[PDB]
Amino acid sequence: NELRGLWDRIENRIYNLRHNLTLDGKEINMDLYDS
Amino acid sequence: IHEYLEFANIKKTEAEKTLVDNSEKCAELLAEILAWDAGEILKAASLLGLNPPQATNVFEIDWIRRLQTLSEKTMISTEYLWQMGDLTENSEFSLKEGVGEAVMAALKAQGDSDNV
Amino acid sequence: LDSPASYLLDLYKFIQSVELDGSNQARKLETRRADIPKLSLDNDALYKEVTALSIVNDVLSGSAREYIDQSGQADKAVNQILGDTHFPFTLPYSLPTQQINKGLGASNIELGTVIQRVDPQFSWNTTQEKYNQVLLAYTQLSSEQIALLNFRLERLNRFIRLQRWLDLPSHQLDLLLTSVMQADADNSQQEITEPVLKSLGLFRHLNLQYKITPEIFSSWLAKSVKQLCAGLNISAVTFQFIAPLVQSALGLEAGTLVRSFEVVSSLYRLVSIPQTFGLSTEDGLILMNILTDEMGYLAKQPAFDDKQTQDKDFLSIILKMEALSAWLTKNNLTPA
Amino acid sequence: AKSVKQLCAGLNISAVTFQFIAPLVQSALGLEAGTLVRSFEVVSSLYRLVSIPQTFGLSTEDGLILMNILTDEMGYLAKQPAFDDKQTQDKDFLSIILKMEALSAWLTKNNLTPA
Amino acid sequence: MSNSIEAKLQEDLRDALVDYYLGQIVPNSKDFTNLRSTIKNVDDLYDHLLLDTQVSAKVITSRLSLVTQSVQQYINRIALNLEPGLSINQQEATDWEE
């Protein structure tokens, strides 16, 4: 079960790094408002 | 509106049709009552039997109400809105390839800002 | 002294002397993946070298587009040949001139293809070919590619695999298509053709405007306790109009106890369709009478093979109900 | 054809104004399609005609009014930047932008319009 | 503008990748076709071309970083596995420490 949890963890972390600008949070875009 | 419609109706067969109703000034008052463009409204000459056309005393005005509001939804011409009709019937492809690009360019001219 | 270049050259002059030869790919691939120690411009460009993902596109595509030139198959065609292939499940017609005509035309002010309903005619009380423009314009999501509708059988299942133009799951198309393919009396596999495909534009329309579900759409396309319990959706005092409905089959106010599908699907039509426009049953019966001189294919069948002979077709009726619901919202009149 | 670039010039101000651009290319040689060469003597005059009136908030149809009213002609829009015509004091371009400003102030002071 | 980005992605996400994969490898070449069995998935396109396809739609960086990354990945990759058939001497195999 550890192999299957491990390879899925690295796939999720690559997806996050491939977006970058989240850091799984929201670094770049925040507090903006309109109207 | 009455003086415009009464003028549009003057003697089409015996006088005015072969004189194009003096299109350069009769079609001007139809724009002036709308405070709108006396130019692109002349595209109506693409239908109704080589008349201006104007003596169809409501339907052209009724359509131009919707052309004026569409012309405020988007900056597209009535000339291009005609192509969006012509493309319906499994028509020639280069006109669709061009119209899609022309509508894209008309959006870039507004962008994420507002512009014109 | 040290630089981004002294870091790079300490790799480059090191990899050059990794000399082992013969049939092995490594240099063959690296030289096929061509770039050189003086790629472009000069090393001081670095601050302006800041660029998006767009830098990658010509490194893949700029060699790839040479295939028609290399094979000698074409040359005057500038790029578009990549929209004109199928068999490797190639996804043809994908060129942006098709997709922007759906997405970009919505993205500004939310108009879509519905613009074909607006012009140049004075009123929507107009001949059949107009509705056949607009309903097909609502189906689109794609292009003239829809003319395409062991391998000799799987190439027919590809018409469901090619649902990719639409955000539809694999359970949707059989639910969508089975009711209309049962309403059509024809026997052979040609039943996939465009006289059925027109129906998905009405689904797309009612979804975008009113958020219906494929189940309800494909469904509408003593026993006294059940006779009363039908009053859950709209109050059973309306069933003075339901004894007039069962005359499309055989029945009586008590004798309708059999609740047959040809009758109860017509109850499903009559209870569902007017409520999309906020109408009561007494207002819906007014629109049908005013527009058609009859029940407008409520109480009767969904017109599907009567539409094959252009007889007051049901697919036009919901457009007329919408067009009047707009005009009767614009003006402070009432159906009564 | 060059029609994509002929339309894409409409980014700054809507291409429906180009009914006035076939009258502009008469300072060189060209036609509504035949202007496809986009030569610097023509496109720098597009750059003048699109830039200078917008400093005062004018539309192209208002800018053409000021030039006609002040000069009886295009006021060195569509033509060259007057630089060696200014050496012989002929309606010089360096005065025109001052007149556009002076009228933009007076026409802001009063609730009239160019039209 | 924010919605035209969708089309500048879609031409590389799909069009440039599938027409390359089928056309170049199977019929056309004496380039990839000498190695016909080696590619079947985007993971092979990544490993063979040294390029980050189908990903990173919002990211910005220097061209020098991409150039570096390709060689930086390759000098890792030849030490990560012994295909293609090259080998690394024990000094060179010590000095990836640097």
Numbering used by the authors:
A (entry chain N): 2795 to 2829
B (entry chain A): 1049 to 1164
C (entry chain A): 156 to 304, 584 to 655, 701 to 815
D (entry chain D): 701 to 815
E (entry chain B): 2001 to 2098
Paper text:
ABC toxins are secreted endotoxins produced by bacterial pathogens of insects and animals. Originally described as Tcs (for toxin complexes), and more recently described as A5BC toxins in reference to their stoichiometry, all three subunits (A, B and C) are required to assemble a complex with full toxicity. YenTcA is the pore-forming and membrane-binding module of YenTc. It has an unusual architecture amongst ABC toxins, in that it is encoded by four genes, two of which represent an apparently split tcA-like gene (yenA1 and yenA2) and two of which encode functional endochitinases (chi1 and chi2).
The current manuscript reports a substantially improved structure of YenTcA isolated from a transposon mutant of the native Y. entomophaga, in its soluble (pre-pore) conformation, determined by single-particle cryo-EM and 3D reconstruction. The resolution of the structure, estimated at 4.4 Å, allows unequivocal assignment of all four unique polypeptide chains within the structure, with an overall atomic model able to be built that accounts for 75% of the complete amino acid sequence. YenTcA is assembled from five symmetrically-arranged protomers, each comprising a single copy of YenA1, YenA2, Chi2 and Chi1. Each protomer contributes a pair of extended α-helices that form a funnel-shaped longitudinal pore at the core of the complex that widens into a β-sandwich domain (the TcB-binding domain) at one end and is enclosed at the opposite end by a ring of five neuraminidase-like domains (again, one is contributed by each protomer). This structure—the pore-forming apparatus—is entirely encoded by the YenA2 chain. A predominantly α-helical shell incorporating regions of both YenA1 and YenA2 forms the next layer, encapsulating the longitudinal pore. The Chi2 proteins form an equatorial ring around the lower half of the α-helical shell, while five, leg-like protrusions emerge from the base of the complex. The molecular interface between YenA1 and YenA2 within a single protomer represents a buried surface area of 2709 Å2 and the C-terminus of YenA1 is in close proximity to the N-terminus of YenA2 (separated by approximately 16 Å). Most notably, a ring of five histidines (H996) forms a constriction (to ~6 Å diameter) about 20 Å above the tip, while the final closure involves hydrophobic interactions of the sidechains of the five L990 residues. Chi2 is incorporated into the overall structure such that its substrate cleft is solvent exposed and opens approximately downwards.
